[model samples]
Target: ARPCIPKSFGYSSVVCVCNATYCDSFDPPTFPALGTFSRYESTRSGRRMELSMGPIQANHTGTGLLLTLQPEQKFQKVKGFGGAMTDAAALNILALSPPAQNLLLKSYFSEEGIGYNIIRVPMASCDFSIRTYTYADTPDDFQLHNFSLPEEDTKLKIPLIHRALQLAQRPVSLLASPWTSPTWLKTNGAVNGKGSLKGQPGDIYHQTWARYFVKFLDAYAEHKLQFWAVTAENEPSAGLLSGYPFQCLGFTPEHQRDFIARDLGPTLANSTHHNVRLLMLDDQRLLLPHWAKVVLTDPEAAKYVHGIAVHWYLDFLAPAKATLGETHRLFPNTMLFASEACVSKFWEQSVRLGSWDRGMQYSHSIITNLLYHVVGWTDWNLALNPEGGPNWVRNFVDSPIIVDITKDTFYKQPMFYHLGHFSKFIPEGSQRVGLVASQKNDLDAVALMHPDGSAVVVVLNRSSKDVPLTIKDPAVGFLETISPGYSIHTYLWHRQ
Candidate 1:
């Protein structure tokens, strides 16, 4: 559990600068769409979300990349967007000087910052934590009499989340997921090894486990923080290995279905937390429709289920439309959530500080998932150390913001701006709209119509050169512009 602190911190100059006193919001332009149009751009050349304005012209062009907006046809409604507030992230933020800590929270949650409303919270210990631990560990206490809020939750996580909720513009939602149950209830009797609940669903082990979730809910409720949703488990598939590297709990499709139907579902339904949502299959794309179908096809489990959770890793093996989209089509009533996403996990080098390429990787996934009916997209850690972790198991990964304890500064990686491109302007109720385009430019774009009648269009220029794109919103006017090479743009305006 010793810290592997870096000797010295080095970051790319292209990354946005933020010192102890304050972080950059980049003076984002006004969003008044009464009659004015606003545009924001974050280019690879270090234009960090600089804003511009111009009059809406009436001329329509058929040359180059042309996209005609059809606002009438709308898709999914965005629930929210943000990253997880893991123990590692909280540890990094809390280590900052008093003023710097406040600046980090303000840079993420305040009105001056990109409004990240949804936060994913890990239930107990994950690899991101400094060590392995849980809320209740006294064995065989079926009532969880020893259950108590650990310092990680009460001291490290609670205060930060409390402050963040006050600053957020949208209704901040929390989604919790447990890494594994205590050793007494796990078949392996160990925290880090591959383990499953000791007995079948409806047995003492499963019932107590369900109550364990309730204990977590009730414990946090004392601090006045209620969970909006809870995924069944974190990376269920990873637990199949003999030597799973971190805290984990294994659940096959049938096991999860029965557990929810016979234990967790009824347990929650019968408690004050019935309204708190339940999401299944918090795993990769490879387990989609198959796991979704197995669980949702059952009437008992379907009643308590609210959404399907998707992680970003292994998405390359399958098309999003085939899994995320197809799952939505099959169960149109259910939600698709990009529950957890992070870069540099499998890379040779971890914590590529100020990596803009990682930013591009994030935006591509966000745009792709949004098009395929993902109502919410969230990143992994809010902030990490210079080495990308305090990870107990050395499972270091990338983060949008990297906190430098030595310098008392936090570097906002390009991924931060990429997230800001959407979260800063696209409000919670914004609905994804259709865009008919005849394009050779191969730009990636997703259009969302805000509840206040504003049209927020996010476009990504993936190519190495400039892309000439014309957006024709017949209700408004046409916009002819040159999209800079390897950039992200958010074009917004209200319709007449």
Candidate 2:
């Protein structure tokens, strides 16, 4: 019962065989979808083979050699972290070409198609900023009555969001995170580079800032859109290397808790928005426990705070906490969400469209986050301009899906299809069932029980070769093939 680390991490590697033939499919098997062939046929050739997998169903309570189940798992949900940015940029490029913008937005938000459902938007501005503006006017104009969305957002960000949601046909949750407050509100008096909030001076416009949040919630609501959650800020403590639109804020945990509990909390109550979760500390994963302490100890803050948010910049931390057991154990009612992460050239090399390892990385993150009983997982950028991102800073990366702005066309990266294996089928409110891995280190798999009493098991072959898989779950059992050299497979089942 030694701590089991995958053999691949060491010099020795595991072997996987299928009928004695060397199976060569990517781990978390690439699902079949429209235009998927184009990804392989044109982008990657002879690099790997596409293996087709079944109508395999899973049982809520099942056991398998490579399968590991997550109990108390509820809700099979998928959300994208950046459609507002995508649509806003698309409109900027398309200008006032209403028809073209409308078409692009529809394509970006369609549910059955490659549309992105969950969207993450900045409250004010960030490094991904196209431009900067605040809701309330400044000294140039103050009783704070002169609040208006800049022309760009109204013409682009808002319109596209409105049209896209109308087409989704589902109650989409808009998870908002602000990178930095307006220049006037910060000690630096500017939006660029790193700087802390001016808390000592008593927050120039604490009441105004609260009003900004309420206004945004109301404005979007007027269009029938809902804010599922809002983090006080995004990556509050990260260093500044690039030209960050809304840079660092040196807010101690006490400062953050007070603003939300005392100021923002009451604002939301007086406003029209309700049941909209108030998320805090949208920082890196490692900081979860630190932020958790802040929320759990405070009286008003703890009550108003709905959950804590995390990003995958620190992927290694996922396995560290036994999947957020400590945080969840202490704050059972709060939700844990992997708010933002995606394919980064800096981390795992550029988006090699058809690389087997690329697909493995994408699924690995999803599986890793789910292990912690995460309520939802989202990618950093939903669609990037060709060449990853048009305005690349520090070589920031692309999402599983990338779009070509010039051609008004899109390319579904390996991660795009890799995600479909789960996003397309695992409907909202699905429960995570039990799964046991013969060797936890060599392979990874999780089971999800749908509302209909059926189950789906997603398996990842992280070893160097294929491993014959056997399912011992009595409710529904079957055999499946997993290709070697990094592969992923999804088995679906239902009792006859």
Candidate 3:
């Protein structure tokens, strides 16, 4: 397939401008107004200027900046990245409300200008949502005989989600994960926080767990729905109930291995939903080694694990990656997918909207993952309500797309547009072309070659003053200078 780079990889960004009307202050200052005078300077006019902002290798460290031109060499090719963490509630919101759903489908799936090929949905309610639920019909039935969709789920999440996917009309990968087994299955018999699964009396319960997967798959399939991937847990290291809807339950590497290879994997492979591949882990990169150690130890789990799933929480720079590199090198056969990451307005207590600061975070995280050979990258949440979410945690943060249902208008954050610069044109199967960085401190650059022989060079300029850049490649003519400030530019060159 031609190298496809979807615009979603550009992620999302925010831009805000305040327009005000004030009385003229002390008469407008007159300046040079040479009316109707026109001059021409031949500097390759009509050539659309593209910007590429990303991370580059600097002294072995991966850092974010604005790249200038095409690189001289070829780096490892980049696969594709994106997913949906838009909680069940948001899906619920979109479903029951058609007008709301229409607006969202149009803005996100249709008009967003980037490809959202991959989306994630919880097996039940996650902490990111307002409430918790599962498909179980009976609370105590480990067999999940009583499982049924909550009134809201049927009324809101499912239908709207299907519509959105149909509108996008691209290959959509759905990742299934459980926040908690069930209220009855938990040690505390509650689903709101960390709880341990109540082991079944015998092998039947284990078998039932597998049955749960089959049931969900079949049920969704009955609705013409399919899941692309599945995870055993979300941050399994989060031990004990910590009051975050679905939380960490001290699930050891042994448990994950035992469940997937012996249980989930075989069942899925044999069942009608055999197409779904098993993804391992939903923890940060720091925990990659921990999980890798487990998989390495377990024969069955190692065989079934397709890739290690990670988030951008842990810094994946040279120093950090050095510590985790051994895990990747040892398990070179396994792929890495970035599953969750976002700008935390609550954690940092700063509104980074319409600013380069947010762009820096997205670019840096992506660059780190790139150097680490993460095959797929996904952001935490696709869209957030104005107040973020209905999380029990008091400090919820914003998402790339923020909607004010009451106002009937939405604002695409800087990160939204920022991600577009990358996602809009880059194809899915493209590789990263290698390039040298001449500017030592302020900028970073990289290039990608599409199968069509068209070249894409992304440059990030960090300084305030515009700097001149040139490329001596025989493929396309070079430019004299690039504009300054924290900006990303992409140059698309079609050979003449």
Candidate 4:
């Protein structure tokens, strides 16, 4: 018999035998005497899991709540986890010294980091920018001859993004979204307030705006950056309301359909970026069926669209699964991406530093969204200052990592580890497998099967009391353990 060769998966410490038949010969794979369980517990007592550990046995009879694992029943393949690289995030890191900057990037982008592989970037300036601006500011430059990448981006955002790409060691997928078009091209003639595109479909301004996307992509390409996808607009419905503090470009379903089918879609197909994906309605979840139907139901518009992007703001107002379920039922083939989410007071309050509750909120959202077929999850900002922002609009929010500019130091908030519980262990090509567990109110769990035959199970405990959990699967027999209350745990093991 040939020796069992070691095989590795993404960032997972566990190694498997390369020979598939040899690995599968056993009824249940043999285990080492020291079967370790890596656990991260967050409590009011102040303990963070950074490469921590405990012990686990293959079979333990327990009277605790039962959580059954169905690894054979698989769902969507994950695109991976990441956060945005907003101008505010870039400026915050730029203010730090070179060594401190390297440390921050390593924590998020490197294999030693939380391992982010996808990033969301604004097409120009959004609320997180120091001020409002655009790539093409010249009035009536319909040919986009005056379009160029802004100095702020060239000096700050581009360098930071390039460094992140180098650290990731893989082609990081960039998703670009526009908060609003140039002030000259908007119906309201201003970028700050909510507005709509100035002209009708196929009009010069609308067509020029479509070309602007290509120009932006071309500019980034000059810096060796490529965008994986682009959204039609950010928070389209927010423009319809009053007193929106930041830049917002509104689009009705009809407006999006016209722009995508008549302009943006055709432009990309004809350009060098024909493979670049076009996503629709980068907005809240509640508008799903109706909002998505407007474009996806139209054969012309649907042909150009690759997926739907959603934010979590409305998930707080209503359960997202129902709306997402409806959207999936209507267009099962369309990819669902959770584009943005964060914890914030929207200028009403200060940043909630080291709040375990905030971390729990993230864990709950990620778990629930993954269950609802969200292929990828991207956070709002990769890093923020201790003040929660340099946001021009005063829309301060919490981030996983908070930097102290004066001291040139940064703190990894509980949410950092909360995200790590998933992002660090579950690689990009993994599939979300089925998990059946009792006591759904107290405990929530999600399971994934990595491409290299390793299984990862993430469990969250929201209750105040510790709960015992028994996870059983035929591939990896029975394993029982206790999950600390108000905590999250990720378990990984090789499987045949």
Candidate 5:
């Protein structure tokens, strides 16, 4: 129950300094009373969840920008929102004082903070780790008898995950993703750069690599952590990069399809963890329509696939509805969600301090994806050092929470609140509904209906000019407000 330590370096930032005794938390606002509505706003100039309320306007239009909601025309259900817990993120959290750690974890998982229900974890080392590693490190151990959770998992990831479960307001769903296979099993003798399993799709090399996933899942099971899903590879195309300089596993659509059909799919389907979901193509959107068609169209592979994961990078290549929407059309039953997104660049790029513009980038993507039937939005890292790293190859990036290990504190970037406009209120299974925005430029919005019979509308006014608008629920009445330029607003109101 501490207050945000607001400061500005490049943008208005809310730094929550923590110690053994106290850390900051933002409590949920009281539910709006009859004839009233609740509003929460975080702006570019530096404001965090500044809450206020006003009486509902009946029948009459108080003329700001007029917006309409069609509660009946709803789309997909949001699974939840979260970021990954990489070695760097967990290490950063563990580096903090224990009490500070408690506050920090609670800040993400507790109802008092922006609740995150889905967490994606890298199975082995990615560039975010201080060093590259795999659960099965010993060479030529086809049986993987030596495989065990690395110290990073036992000391860092597991402990933090256990605490997150205890603090989360809703059930937590975990997704496990691997960066690459053991070098000895790969055609290339290194974990980084381009490589593939040494043998053909159904051979021992491919088969054993598949079991490696089962072993990772089983080992974590002993520690009472169950994964909700797993991706076939974390950016498999990275292997195609000449000296890509990061952990990667190369696979063409045909290679991946054959692997799933002949090795990975059957291996998992034959395991104790068969019920776990399998998501493929954990890469960018530009790779989609073709990616989904090849892998999903193959019956042997499609039968085992539950979803298609995508990265937010390369989104500029096409429109969300055209790309993501097209995938959904072909594979309607398959889940579609963003699995990785971060403002990543080398530590040399700098963290872009007090980055409010960075927040807009996040909102822009979330708003569009939700419209395109995306069910979840999971970010790349939950937290990272002030330098945006601990990355082995210096592939550092900005995270929502920038840990100031030296100060026993963390700064919540504008992007954090930007995600909150949806995650904090949209809980799993909240159905997306229709929201039509007026002709006003730079104003974007999406609406949803919570199971408890409440309506939530999130609006982003990106332009520099403030605009007044009234949100009208066709069946209900309307409410009026002014959306400040470069600010986000989340409005909640229950039926009268």
Candidate 6:
């Protein structure tokens, strides 16, 4: 047998073994049919086309909508796709039987699953937790002797994360965000509701809070969990009305800049965990431009930050991608990551389990964000109970995988397949290639060029009627009459 040496590309290489076409003249024969495209579609009539890897013929004459690919014009490199492993999510998974737990983990972390390679974790207790708590809650513990990981985390979240890491068998980026500082460090001395940090920019409380983050990194490290990034605070600009429940700590633009420049920035730079990225503003997208400008404009503050994190809630309120593009325009080098997103009960009237429309919502938001240069996306919760949540605050939300705790069964919703279309195919280090679509209003599409010379194009048909589209790749010819109706389609092909 001839030795199998895969052809090497720029950064990576792939073997032309399966379904590869050979030519006598070429040393490494061209693989015209080397790559396979798969589709997982959920219809309005409650039917799913699960992983349909079928034949797509090239027809030069057929056309309904044209999506042109320009692989040479690539944008930001994708970090990867994943969901949050919140305390609630961890609790839900733990409640299941041992076998059920393994099954749940395999669904998201395994290659046979959605292949989630990025995860957002709460630094401390948030609304997602059974109750509000912090790693350090001692009053005036500026020296931070009392700081420690909560039992909930050590016994539950940490072990679950370790299992996930083992199952992943690859590097997974974990982003930690704090919902609020410890109650002792807040103005109102309470974790819930809106409260600012208890002091001026240069105050002891501010310095203590900065050190608190370092302590978290250290504590998680003891459990052998390394974080890839940490945000200044979750929803730094968010404030609740009087008596409103839910955790949020407010930070004015000036406050964030001062903390980052004077406290968090300097501490991390001089600490052992300097390599971990410092992300700013775990808030909504519409406010990204203003928030990013305020933080990045100052050379001193910008030095410590690596990226900006945005959420999807504002998309419904403002419905604009301009802020994302504008933020990228201003801070071209700074990475933009969607740290948290989900359909919540606060906005939606019903849970709508296995809803196709809900899944389409994810596809649309993800495509739109990627188009505007979001390097990565992390959905809010990886798994939730049947009632949306076991939230202590009664603030429930949807997830890709929902578990029926009573029966010890888990349901992979349409949203799960919708997200897998991207996460499973487009691995880390894939660059977003240029894609020009003729029908923009109803059809959304984005292209990615993997390091292994494989190209992936994800298209979403959000319209009522079916769309017959032709994806024209000059190098690989055309894929015609790829009719996708109110669904998401991912097309993959290997380049010569």
TM-score of each: 0.96, 0.78, 0.78, 0.90, 0.96, 0.90
Model 6, global lDDT: 0.76
Leading candidate by lDDT: 5
Model 6 per-residue lDDT tens digits across residues 64-132: 678888988879999999888888899888887787788678768886666789988898788878888
Clashes of each: 0, 27, 51, 0, 3, 0
Question: All models: lDDT?
Answer: 0.84, 0.56, 0.55, 0.78, 0.85, 0.76
What is candidate 1's lDDT per residue for 29-112, written digit by digit as tens? 456654467888887666776677766678765378888889889899999888898999999999889788887787778767
Better of 4 and 6 by lDDT: 4
| Candidate 3 error regions (>4 Å) | 1-79, 88-103, 192-194, 200-202, 240-248, 314-320, 345-355, 451-453, 462-465, 471-474, 477-479
Q: Write the per-residue lDDT of candidate 4 for residues 379-413, one digit (tens) a residue.
A: 99888876778888775578887777887766666
Candidate 5 per-residue lDDT over residues 1-496, each given as its tens digit: 4566676665444444455567556766578676788898888776777778987767756655778888878689888999999998999888889988888788788888889999999988988888888888899899999998888899899999999999996999999999988899888889887787787998989989999999999999999999989999888888777688988989988899999999999999999999999999999889979999999988999999999999987787777877898999998999897999765433335465567777888998898888888999889889888788888887456888888888887777788889888888899889999888766456878899988868899999878899888888766678878899889999998875
All models, RMSD in angstroms: 4.0, 9.2, 9.9, 8.5, 1.8, 8.9
Worst 10 residues of 4 by lDDT: 19-28
lDDT of 5: 0.85
Off-target runs (Cα >4 Å) in candidate 2 are 1-111, 114-116, 140-143, 200-204, 239-248, 317-319, 345-352, 392-394
lDDT of 3 by residue, 1-496 (tens): 1111121122232232111111101111112121111111101111112222222222222223223434455544544545465453364245324555454454445423355566676675666666555677375586676766664455555676686687664555677766666555556666555565556322554566677878877777777778878776777767453664444444667766777766777878889788787777787666667778876667767777777777565554324475346667777777777767665543553233444557656755565566566766667666665466655444345566555456554444556544544554455666666555545556555566665555555555555655555533344333334435656565555443
Error of 3 at 125 (Å): 0.5
Q: Write the per-residue lDDT of candidate 2 for residues 1-496, one digit (tens) a residue.
A: 0111111212122111111112112322233432121111111112222334443334323233444344454543433323435433543435424444444444345554333567776665444555555565364332356666665556656666676678765456788876656667666676656565555423446666677777778766776678888887677665233445334554567777878776778877777786777888777777767678876688878878877887777766555364366777777777787777565444463434445456667677777767666767666655555455444243356555444455443444556545655564465666776676666457766777766666567766657665666654454344444434465555555543
Q: Candidate 4: list runs displaced more than 4 Å.
A: 1-44, 50-58, 345-348, 438-441
Question: TM-score of the candidate numbered 5?
Answer: 0.96
Off by over 4 Å in 1: 1-13, 26-29, 32-35, 345-347
